[PDB]
Amino acid sequence: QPHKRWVFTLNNPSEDERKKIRDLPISLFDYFIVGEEGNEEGRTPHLQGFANFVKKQTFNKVKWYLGARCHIEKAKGTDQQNKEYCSKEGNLLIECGAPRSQGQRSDLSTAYSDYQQSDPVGMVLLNCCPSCRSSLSEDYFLGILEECYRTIHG
Amino acid sequence: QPHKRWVFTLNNPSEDERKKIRDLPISLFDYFIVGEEGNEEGRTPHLQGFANFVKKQTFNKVKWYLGARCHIEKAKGTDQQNKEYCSKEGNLLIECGAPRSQGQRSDLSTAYSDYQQSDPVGMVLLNCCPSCRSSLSEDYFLGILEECYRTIHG
């Protein structure tokens, strides 16, 4: 059976295996995060990753995209919990997209009339899906853009 | 059978029926557009709408969210073609969300390495769904935010 959500490990990645994963077209994924782990000489160097594909993929398809030596399993838990797990050693190879938010414990209004057409940031948030809106409402780079807009229109 | 993608018509909407549809939580939809049509004195005033729900909905559930009086049918065509159809008389009741692009075409790079961490706009586009990215890369309000950032950092 195919699924959209997969976790994976690759032990001792080569330069070329890292480049393959980093060169995957970002159009494949709703969300994708690959962390590089085990740099310390005690342990095994390895990629730790989570892919939420736009459409369901067979096991074989996932092997092709990530590489034949990857150990691949159906993902358990929330996109958010997988984000935290794959980023806990602070060294990302690639991160594209935004985690899917299944239980929407957002702080963010669900009322169309609270999004003011005089607020570009608010309009950016209005004009994307529930998962992307929730992620972008906390995004550092959208926060920079908000700060520049406030500076000029203040 | 349930589906994400539905079109609808409501003839002679009351004030209250319009307010119901405008008060729908924006968390329900990947994309939602309702236009108000038939203003001219010859014809019947009516809502013309398209909903792409986050999860699949039965006919009965769609009736619950919209009107019971709404005529509802499964959607055919792309989200984009439905957006153009529902906006052709220039008077939106509500639009919230971004159309789902089935890969279609983008002109936007699919290479992670073309999104520069020194570019906040580029990082906003990187950090979202492939469908939200394509839609936001043409968004008027993200364009205003780009313009303010360039003003300050040019």
d(Cα B65, Cα B100) in Å, to the nearest integer? Answer: 21
CATH of domain B3-97: 3.40.1310.20
Rounded to the nearest angstrom, the minimum Cα separation between B110 and chain A is 5
Residue found by looking up tokens 């229109």 in the block: A153
d(Cα A147, Cα A44) in Å, to the nearest integer? Answer: 42
Distances (CA, A) of B154 to A121, A153, A154, B142: 21, 18, 20, 18
Q: What's CA A111's distance to the chain center, in Å? A: 26
Partners of B106 on chain A (C-beta within 8 Å) are: 27
Partners of A141 on chain B (C-beta within 8 Å) are: 120-121, 123-124, 127
Nearest to B129 by CA among A103, A118, A75, A128: A128
SS (H, E, C) B19-82: HHHHCCCHHHEEEEEEEEECCCCCCCCEEEEEEEEEEEECHHHHHHHCCCCCEEEECCCCHHHH
Distances (CA, A) of A11 to A37, A58, B25, B136: 10, 22, 45, 37
Residue found by looking up tokens 């520069």 in the block: B116
Resolution of the coordinates in A?
2.3
What type of residue sits at position A45?
Answer: P
Report CB contact under 8 Å: A139, B123: yes
Sign of CA dihedral A62, A65, A71, A72: negative
Rounded to the nearest angstrom, the minimum Cα separation between B119 and chain A is 8
Nearest to A91 by CA among A43, A62, A48: A48
What type of residue sits at position A113?
Answer: S
User: What pairs with residue A96 in β-bridges?
Assistant: A32
Largest CA distance in chain A: 56
**Is B37 labeled as ligand-binding?**
yes
Best A28, A100, A141 member to test B by mutation, with max B CBs in 10 Å, is A141
Best B127, B144, B149, B152 member to test A by mutation, with max A CBs in 10 Å, is B127
- Active site annotation includes B31: no
Nearest to B31 by CA among B141, B144, B131: B131
Residue of B nearest to A117 (CA): B141
Residue found by looking up tokens 């983008």 in the block: B106
The minimal CB distance from A110 to the residues B26, B54, B145 is found for B26
Residue A22, φ and ψ in degrees, nearest 5: -70, -25
Catalytic residues of A: 85
Report CB contact under 8 Å: B130, A27: yes
**B93 with B35: CB under 8 angstroms?**
yes
* Angle of CA points A81, A86, A87, to nearest 5°: 100
Residue found by looking up tokens 């790079």 in the block: B109
Residue found by looking up tokens 């890969």 in the block: B103
Single out the catalytic residue among B31, B65, B85, B112: B85
- Tokens representing A53 are 């594909």
**Is B46 labeled as ligand-binding?**
yes
